[PDB]
């Protein structure tokens, strides 16, 4: 005791938000850079390779949702203990999270492996290509524990204000994956399965770094040991109260993404899907800096909640919205001004430009509801974050998108407008709910 991250969490909230979110936004951007790169190599492999990825993709997102959920529940719980100066508690949460990483990770592997065959067959696919999907699935499912472990380890680092090493772990992993991708796919001629091995190997190396920090170097604020160790049902409940709704939040988005597609089909057709997919993929690029700010918000408000300092919690929460609002203003202005240039660099051109001229508007009010959810997780109330996510993406997004298409003259335009109007309302409601929760904290 202590570390720079702990001093950061216990210091100025405005200084904490900036110094924590920046490494997170960078780490997530490099991860996005990998997806853009991998999307290029695989695209030139054929229709059989793309069909194999699409079959395991929902399963992949399922693993990620569970891994990231356990991670944020870990970071939130650790941040609150450190704020409350509960050293033994923070140490105990870290140990619990690592044990859960083994339990959750291996369970995913042993559950999906024998079920991955009939799953691909049920999704209207005979193999042929489904057989290629299994081989691709085996590799990634083999490292399900590695995935969850890396998210937990990253969660521990974020929990004690160590966004630096957390960023490093993300950069090393995605960076190595960017390197191995063309080598495994083309140079070695492994095809699309090579991309799986490249990902698996990059994850393993990342784990070797994390394990070295946590178990070998042991230079972390929290102390990790099984001596003598004691199972805590309160710590388990504290992690799952944030972790589980965090995973279900991703399920809500995925379900919502499915219905938004169906509405885009009826508008619509394959032409409507192509435009929506392209417009959404570009728009969600500006979401990345908001996510990094959300991860910082959870840790800072969590530490402030542990310190029983509502003023510090409110400051960090409102300051995170302010910065993210300014960033999105630059992002939205860039996209709308240079829409034909952006559409040209990612390619239905006429419909895509109009979509980019209307859709990314919601990014402006997005931070108002996303930081509220982030601070809800920070104080340990993940259920409110789940309810807010369900309301935003299922009730508002799908709701308004279904109305402007089936009840109005607007075609594809009604889809973008519905998504924009929908979550902007949820942004106001979410923000208002945040002010009510903070007012209740002052009285408590």
């Amino acid at each position: 005791k202590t570390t720079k991250g702990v001093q950061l969490l216990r210091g100025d909230p405005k200084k904490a938000i900036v110094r924590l979110s920046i490494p997170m936004m960078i780490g997530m951007s490099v991860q996005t850079l990998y997806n853009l790169a991998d999307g290029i190599w695989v695209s030139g492999l054929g229709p059989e390779s793309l069909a194999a990825v699409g079959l395991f993709f929902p399963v992949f997102m399922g693993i990620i949702a569970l891994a990231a959920g356990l991670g944020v529940g870990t970071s939130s719980a650790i941040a609150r203990r450190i704020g409350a100066r509960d050293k033994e508690g923070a140490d105990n949460v870290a140990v619990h999270s690592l044990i859960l990483s083994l339990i959750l990770g291996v369970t995913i592997t042993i559950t999906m492996l024998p079920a991955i065959d009939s799953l691909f067959r049920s999704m209207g696919a005979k193999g042929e290509a489904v057989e290629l999907a299994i081989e691709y699935a085996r590799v990634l499912l083999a490292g399900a524990f590695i995935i969850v472990f890396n998210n937990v380890g990253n969660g521990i680092l974020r929990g004690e204000g160590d966004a630096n090493r957390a960023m490093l772990a993300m950069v090393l992993g995605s960076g190595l994956n960017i390197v191995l991708d063309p080598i495994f796919i083309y140079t070695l001629g492994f095809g699309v399965v090579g991309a799986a091995y490249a990902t698996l190997l990059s994850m393993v190396v990342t784990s070797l770094f994390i394990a070295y920090w946590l178990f070998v170097k042991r230079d972390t604020y929290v102390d990790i040991t099984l001596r003598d160790f004691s199972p805590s049902r309160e710590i388990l409940k504290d992690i799952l109260r944030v972790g589980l709704p965090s995973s279900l939040s991703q399920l809500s988005m995925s379900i919502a993404m499915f219905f938004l597609n169906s509405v885009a089909i009826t508008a619509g057709g394959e032409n409507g899907v192509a435009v929506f997919t392209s417009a959404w993929r570009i728009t969600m690029l500006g979401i990345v800096p908001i996510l990094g700010m959300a991860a910082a918000t959870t840790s800072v408000t969590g530490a402030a909640y542990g310190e029983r300092n509502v003023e510090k919690l409110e400051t960090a929460y409102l300051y995170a919205i302010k910065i993210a609002f300014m960033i999105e203003l630059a992002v939205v202005a860039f996209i709308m001004l240079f829409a034909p240039q952006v559409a040209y660099l990612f390619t239905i051109k006429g419909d895509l430009i109009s979509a980019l001229r209307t859709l990314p508007v919601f990014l402006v009010l997005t931070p108002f509801g996303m930081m509220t959810s982030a601070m809800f997780q920070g104080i340990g109330e993940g259920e409110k974050s789940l309810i807010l996510t369900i309301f935003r993406t299922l009730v508002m997004q799908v709701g308004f998108a279904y109305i402007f298409v089936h009840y109005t003259t607007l075609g594809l335009r009604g889809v973008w407008i519905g998504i924009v109007i929908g979550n902007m309302v949820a942004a106001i409601v979410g923000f208002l709910w945040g002010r009510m929760r903070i007012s209740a904290l002052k009285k408590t």
């Binding site: 780490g27 997530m28 997806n35 999307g39 990620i64 949702a65 891994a67 990231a68 992993g173 991703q250």
Partner: peptide
């Protein structure tokens, strides 16, 4: 990437 579920594939 792996630490953020909502991206998603691209």
């Amino acid at each position: 990437x792996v630490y953020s579920a909502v991206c998603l594939y691209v």
